Design a protein around this ligand. Structure first.
Ligand SMILES: [Zn+2]
Length: 665
DNA sequence: GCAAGGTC
């Protein structure tokens, strides 16, 4: 049988598609084999050496520690021996273990990042011979990249491996201990056993939602005033908002008074042609943001649809931060694949506006292991509309990036009020060449109605208004805008961000208020408890500091052992200081879950704090009265008018509106 | 039991 083979080198890939692609790169007829119901590949013909290519399935090993508190040591163990979720990995473990027995040497061909180095290391270490190990380094999954990596096989980068291991240790230490400190404190106080968690990523994310929700529910809009004018010039009546703001309504009224009756004169005309840049290809964060804005799909669902499309061979590997396509990726093969599909009409358009040359508009962000998300060229069949909407975004985004920047004709009129130092512009845009706007057609570009003015034309300011504008709070969070905030803060990875948000929901820390996501009462107190006794775990700075130490490990500037001991010092010091207050923590937690029931606020479910009000409803009144004074000085309105306008604004925090409502009776 | 991180 063809699948019998001896004296080969064992090439370990991170996933089954990567293994297949490597096998296809090294032989034109690689041998498909099957054992423990896992596919693997034999190469009998690559330059007179034998190779077996076997996929892992993500991590096959994970840290495992003792039970109890606190625990400052853990061991790598088979994931299936500890986690019944990842029982899926056992058959991969068994296959690789079997194949390692006859192998002459081992090559880690997992993805070229910190986690890939660890996955392959632990597999070779525990199932193979780490003394006979080498590394394959490729940043894309093309034959050229793979065969070049294969030719340039090097020794293991232990600095990269140790950074990866350090990341696991740090996250295990803080995640497990602090999560246990939460559960153990409640257990000793309330004699209740509930699942509570904290972590380097999930907890700064919870606190962000909680802090924003607090400031928002306490927000009072403050008033400012701007002036708009009516300009009669020739057949035209122009309504112009003057770029000047006023705190006091009286100085806005004096400004408007000084503009009315004055003459305005066109002093400059500029006809300029602007290029509107075509988009770059998607990274997962861009795709999540766009799919959210255009279709309302949640970032966790976008991640899993993108995965299904990639498992179907329709798009490249989606868990990528890159917005770049490297030169080893055949654009021609994608375009001609998309020609043999329903997109051929758009391809013909791209071929037209480019003169037949497809140049990717390379984005800024990179990824060491993968290029940006792009269609493979394979034509889809039987995509439910939800999976087609994602595929179409990716394909039109890629096709748009290989097309042409759009051309805009801007007519800009500079008008000056004669007898006053005030200039202001009036402009309309007309789209010369839509170009990518017809391909990635998810961008509305406003073409105003043309206005024909000439240098020397004059008009009168015949009217105007003082316009009030009320200040605005921070916006509410959606799952996608939270995703965006995490990426912006460098929390999580393309894979974990969606999932970690869903963890915060499953722990009942956050919940869905329709479109939005809002903290629960449990979430509120967990943020407070964690900021009080474990503030490091609640700041995005912990990830920044950890990333910095990890880059030092990767570059030979520090030892993993130091970083872990330092981490243990900080955690333990908090652990010591914690288990004195550990019954207050359980107490706060007991209140958090509604076990210590309490006297409720006059207006909500929170615990009353002063004058019959919870601490936030009390602060809402303090802040309201301060604001009401500011409104008085600025607007000259009477008290009832101020309240009723504050009660009218969607910007007004809920807690404030409860008090205003009451003040109005 | 709990993290964050791979992938299924
Ligand atoms: Zn209250």
């Amino acid at each position: 049988n063809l699948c019998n083979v001896n004296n080969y080198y064992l090439i370990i890939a991170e996933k089954s598609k990567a293994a297949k692609k490597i096998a296809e790169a090294l032989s034109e007829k690689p041998i498909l084999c099957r054992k423990y119901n896992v596919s693997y590949w034999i190469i009998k013909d690559h330059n007179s050496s034998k190779y077996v290519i076997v996929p892992a399935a993500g991590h096959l090993f994970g840290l495992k520690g003792e039970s109890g508190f606190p625990v400052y040591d853990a061991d790598w163990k088979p994931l299936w021996e500890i986690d019944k979720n990842s029982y899926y990995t056992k058959r991969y473990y068994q296959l690789i273990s079997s194949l390692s027995k006859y192998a002459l040497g081992f090559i880690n061909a997992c993805d070229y990042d910190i986690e890939g180095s660890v996955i392959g290391y632990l597999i070779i270490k525990n199932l193979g011979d780490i003394k006979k190990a080498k590394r394959m380094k490729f940043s894309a999954l093309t034959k050229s990249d793979i065969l070049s990596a294969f030719r340039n096989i090097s020794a293991l980068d232990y600095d990269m491996i140790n950074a990866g291991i350090a990341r696991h240790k740090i996250d295990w230490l803080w995640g497990i201990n602090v999560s246990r400190a939460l559960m153990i404190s409640l257990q000793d106080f309330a004699k209740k056993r509930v699942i509570l968690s904290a972590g380097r990523v999930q907890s700064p994310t919870l606190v962000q939602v909680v802090n924003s929700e607090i400031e928002r529910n306490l927000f009072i809009p403050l008033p400012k005033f701007t002036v708009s004018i009516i300009v009669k010039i020739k057949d035209y009546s122009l309504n112009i908002k003057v770029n000047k703001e006023f705190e006091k309504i009286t100085e806005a009224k004096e400004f408007l008074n000084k503009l009315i009756n004055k003459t305005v004169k066109v002093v400059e005309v500029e006809n300029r042609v602007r290029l509107l840049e075509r988009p770059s290809p998607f990274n997962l964060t861009d795709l999540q943001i766009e799919a959210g804005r255009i279709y309302g799909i949640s970032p966790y669902n976008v991640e899993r649809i993108a995965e299904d499309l990639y498992l179907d061979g329709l798009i490249s590997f989606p868990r990528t931060n890159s917005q770049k396509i490297p030169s080893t990726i055949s654009i021609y093969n994608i375009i001609k694949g998309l020609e043999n599909s329903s997109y051929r009409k758009l391809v013909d358009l791209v071929r037209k506006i480019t003169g037949g040359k497809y140049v990717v508009k390379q984005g800024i962000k990179d990824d060491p292991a993968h290029p940006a998300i792009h269609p493979t060229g394979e034509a889809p069949k039987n995509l439910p509309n939800s999976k087609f909407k994602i595929y179409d975004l990716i394909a039109r985004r890629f096709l748009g990036s290989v097309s042409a920047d759009a051309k805009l004709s801007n007519t800009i009129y500079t008008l000056k009020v004669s007898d006053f130092p005030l200039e202001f512009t009036v402009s309309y845009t007309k789209i010369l060449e839509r170009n990518w706007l017809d391909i990635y057609h998810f961008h509305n570009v406003k073409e105003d109605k043309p206005i024909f003015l000439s240098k020397g034309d004059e008009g009168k300011i015949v009217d105007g208004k003082v316009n009030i504008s009320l200040s605005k709070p921070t916006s509410r969070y959606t799952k996608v805008s939270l995703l965006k905030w995490m990426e912006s803060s460098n929390l999580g990875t393309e894979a974990t961000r969606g999932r970690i948000i869903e963890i915060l929901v499953k722990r009942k820390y956050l919940t869905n208020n329709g479109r939005y996501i809002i903290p629960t009462k449990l979430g509120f107190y967990i943020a407070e408890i964690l900021n009080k006794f474990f503030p490091d775990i609640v700041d995005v700075r912990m990830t920044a500091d950890m990333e910095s130490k990890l880059e030092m490990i990767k570059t030979g500037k520090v030892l993993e052992s130091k970083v872990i001991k330092e981490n243990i010092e900080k955690l333990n010091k908090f652990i010591e200081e914690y288990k004195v207050n550990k019954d207050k923590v359980g107490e706060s937690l007991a209140k958090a879950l509604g076990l210590i029931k309490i006297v409720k606020c006059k207006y909500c479910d929170l615990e009353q704090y002063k004058d019959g009000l919870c601490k936030y409803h009390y602060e809402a009144k303090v802040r309201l009265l301060d604001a009401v004074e500011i409104w008085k000085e600025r607007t000259k309105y009477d008290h009832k008018k101020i309240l009723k306008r504050i009660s009218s604004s969607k910007s007004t925090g809920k807690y404030v509106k409860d008090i205003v409502t009451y003040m109005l009776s």
